[PDB]
Design a protein around this ligand. Sequence first.
Ligand SMILES: O=c1ccn([C@@H]2O[C@H](COP(=O)(O)OP(=O)(O)O)[C@@H](O)[C@H]2O)c(=O)[nH]1
Ligand SMILES: [Mg+2]
Length: 351
Amino acid sequence: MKIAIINMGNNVINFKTVPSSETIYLFKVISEMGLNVDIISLKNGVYTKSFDEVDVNDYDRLIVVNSSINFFGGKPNLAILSAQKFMAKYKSKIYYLFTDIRLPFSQSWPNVKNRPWAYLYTEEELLIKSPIKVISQGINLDIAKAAHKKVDNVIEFEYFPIEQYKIHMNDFQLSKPTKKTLDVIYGGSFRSGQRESKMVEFLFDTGLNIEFFGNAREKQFKNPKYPWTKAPVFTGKIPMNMVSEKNSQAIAALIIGDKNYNDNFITLRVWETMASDAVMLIDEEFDTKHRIINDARFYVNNRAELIDRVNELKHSDVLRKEMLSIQHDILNKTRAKKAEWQDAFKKAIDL
Ligand SMILES: O=c1ccn([C@@H]2O[C@H](COP(=O)(O)OP(=O)(O)O)[C@@H](O)[C@H]2O)c(=O)[nH]1
Ligand SMILES: [Mg+2]
């Protein structure tokens, strides 16, 4: 029994980038789960084997970490191409980890045939034929099966809270009380505008001391539909494995998602925030039934309510700690199902 995990459109090396990080974390959870795994990437490294130094069939299971198959600019991307070649020559079922609404599996050949460097590849070389099993972290598999309507070989859809791997790591631990220097914080990319409305709403013009770390930059927010005057301070990216210490820097941390994330996906930032020293403030529309935490104080419907909830936490340290204590206790309740989670994952990949 041997398992291989690879990223479909990103090189894997260290914790500098997010796609590389989530892949190594997945590598780690599966190993700690008592399974023999290898990460296959462009070159050999601390956590990876080289695409051209291994035989895809030495493995009995192939797990693919979703990614964008877009060749930005006029250049070939080996991360995407090499990953698809690897997959293309694999005989058995491929397990596609669908963790981002906008990254469904898809043939890369259509995007290559018309490129000018198309002569370097053949259809037979990149055309992935194996049956595809899509493991979606969305409770309602129907967002996943909708994005995968155009692709044939996809014969299966199964739910599984993939991103719970942050809390099931053996080295995981809750953030400790930390000297506050921020009112609210949020870390992530611009998501190519898919979430501008929510970001402007809860992080702009609040009158509070807010920070937006991550890849997003101020100058990207210019959609006329979502005006603003005072923007939050942008501080750039940091390693994924430093995210909880960062959130812990603020009194409260924001949880928002894409439209199709709502009442479906319980993302990674939910656990990174819930486990930090920052009170978790969820956007109502993101989890209307309150599945994350059954206490309406952790939810904010709009900008005014956020400002209000925060002014409360700023006025009462007794309240801030009471809420921290509550979310931490709830997080521990999900952790106590580690065994049940690992088993569900083993079943997902037909083990
Ligand atoms: O500087 C940063 C900001 C974010 N992240 C990671 O990227 C995720 C955010 O991803 P994205 O911006 O796509 O938001 P989502 O769509 O996951 O809500 C966070 O949860 C972290 O794991 C990171 O590693 N460094
Ligand atoms: Mg994500």
